[PDB]
Structure formats: C-alpha cells, structure tokens
Structure 1
C-alpha cells in the first residue's frame, strides 16, 4: 500500500480510524498535540471505501494511551492489521475490526506514543509508533 510516516509530535489528541467487521482496519488519521496546540495529521486513506468511521477524542492532556493491541491475519490474500484496541488511563477504545489471527500488544509503563508510521493499501498493512518521554 502507500507508506506513511507522521513523525513525532508532543502528544495525541484524537485518533480517527475506520474498520469493517468482516475485513480489517481501513483508514487512519491522528490529531496530534504540537507544543500545546492541535496539529491535524495527514489522513491515511484506504484505496477502497465503505468502512465504518470511529473518532477517539482524548481528554488531552490528562488522558493518554497506555496500551495498543490488535490482531493481524489474512484478508483476500493480504496479511493486514484486522483489529485495533487503544487502552488509556481513562478507558478502553475498541476492539475495532475483527479479532482473529495473531495478536500483538505494546503496553507502556513509562513514556508516550507521539507519532505513527505504517502502510495502508486496501487495509492497514502494518504500523510502528514513535515513543518519547
């Protein structure tokens, strides 16, 4: 798919994503914090459409993500990220998508996710996270 790399920012204000309960995660966009101001990141869009949108609006700066988890598995011959869940200090958002296949998880004991990179074709193929103090 199309590689994307937002780089690193000050914090996360909102995550927008889309998913379909029979395929996988589709689109992905973050509103970052940049030094106390919102910075609206690029919208990483699927090549197809018809997904269900989800807006995760965090109570920044008091609310922050402590754990990202999900599943990867094969959809129409492509191994992609099928499901995502975001656990903050306030609550759990998700799972979005289909929770089948091979799980993964990144819990954070100390530090903050401050950016995302990855690749999206029809679906989110993979992603990585920038971490900072």
Structure 2
C-alpha cells in the first residue's frame, strides 16, 4: 500500500517535443487510445491514481491517424511496451508501438522502422501510465511501473 511508482524512460527523441506527463501518481491503467498511421500520431490513456481518482491523460501528439481504443479488465495488466523510433517529417518520432499484457498482444501500430525500444516489466509488475514528449507525433515515450 502506497509503494512509490517507478518512472523509466523515455525512449525516442532525446530533446524534441513538448513535455507531457501526468500530475497524480498512477496506480492502475484502465484504457489506452492510440491514433496511428505510418507513425504513432497520438496517445491518450485513462488511469486511477494514488487516491483512487480516475483521470484521462492526453492526447499527446497530433491530430492524424486512425484511432484504436483498448480497455483493460481488472485482471489484465500491461507488462511490456515496445516499438521503434526514427526520422519522420524531420523529427525523431515513435514510428511503431506495441502493448503486451498478461493476456494479449496489441499491435504493431504504425510502421516498424528505425531503432527498437522495449520496456519489459518482470515479476507481475504493471506499467500503469506514461510520460514523454510530443508535437504532431509522439517524439519520446516513457512508462510508470508499479510492482505487486
């Protein structure tokens, strides 16, 4: 109860984009809405915080792409985020992303081009939120991790 969250990343552009983050420490990831096309245009997500209050973060990114909304049931948790990043329209962007839970694999979204990244959380720990930098695309993405 009230174990501090771990913040890891980001991966992607070292210095491009507007900082994006959540204000209340996250405890449970409820949904992700991802817009994607050739690259990863935007991410939004809902999460429950340290006080049991739900928030929508985002969208972080631009208005392009087609949406997919992913809702996690109470027994589903995110155990790895992976993807690629590279040059797109003159910036380094997240070109593809994947979400691997204890139940399923969602993705790839985008195009698998450029440099890989991966953040596998072990020991049944969950990825419970995100942070990063964005413009018209996601330039860099990191994760919040909460053990059990």
Task: Give TM class, smaller chain.
Answer: 0.7 to 0.9
State the shift of 1:45 in Å.
3.9
1:1-133 alignment, distance < 5 Å? 1-7=17-23, 8-20=25-37, 22=38, 24-34=39-49, 39-47=54-62, 49-59=63-73, 61-110=74-123, 111-133=125-147
> What RMSD, in angstroms, separates the aligned Cα atoms of the two structures?
1.8
State the shift of 1:35 in Å.
6.0
State the shift of 1:16 in Å.
0.7
Q: Give the paired residue count.
A: 129
Contact 1:4–1:44 under 8 Å retained in 2: no
Length-normalised TM-score, structure 1: 0.87
Q: How big is each residue's C-alpha offset from its partner over 1:85-122, in whole Å with a ceiling of 9 and x where there is no partner?
A: 00111110000001111111111112221221101101
Contact 1:13–1:38 under 8 Å retained in 2: no
Gaps of 5+ in 1: none
State the shift of 1:6 in Å.
1.2
Distance 1:98 1:38 in 2: 35
Change over 3 Å in CA distance of 1:36–1:87 after alignment to 2: farther
Length-normalised TM-score, structure 2: 0.79
| 4+ residue segments displaced more than 6 Å | none
